Amino acid sequence: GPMEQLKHCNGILKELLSKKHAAYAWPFYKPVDASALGLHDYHDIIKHPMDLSTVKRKMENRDYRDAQEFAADVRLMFSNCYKYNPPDHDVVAMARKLQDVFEFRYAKMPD
């Protein structure tokens, strides 16, 4: 059921935030600070910002009703990176590596 599947989602989230993946997960830890990064068009291009700290707060607050809602947010965060940047940027390479971790473990969710 949704609560058990959400436990698996919480496990995935913990893994994505763990030292194991820190070499490529770090960009996704906190909301993009567009002003600090000089990305003055970021919020014109990205209508729905997302990041792992926001996903974690939503999980902790029981905001996600099912695993599909959680996965849509995680995928939104990666898609924003693919949308904003040229495909050969290092931040996109990091997004792709972290998304592989996410998708392969999400595919192991119990029914």
Ligand SMILES: O=c1cc(N2CCOCC2)oc2c(-c3ccc4c(c3)OCCO4)cccc12
């Ligand atoms: O979509 C993104 C676009 C960019 N950009 C900055 C780099 O150049 C390309 C444009 O950063 C993102 C970051 C990020 C966050 C903090 C950083 C960082 C990058 O880089 C070093 C300094 O701390 C995180 C998630 C998505 C993006």
Ligand code: NA
């Ligand atoms: Na989805």
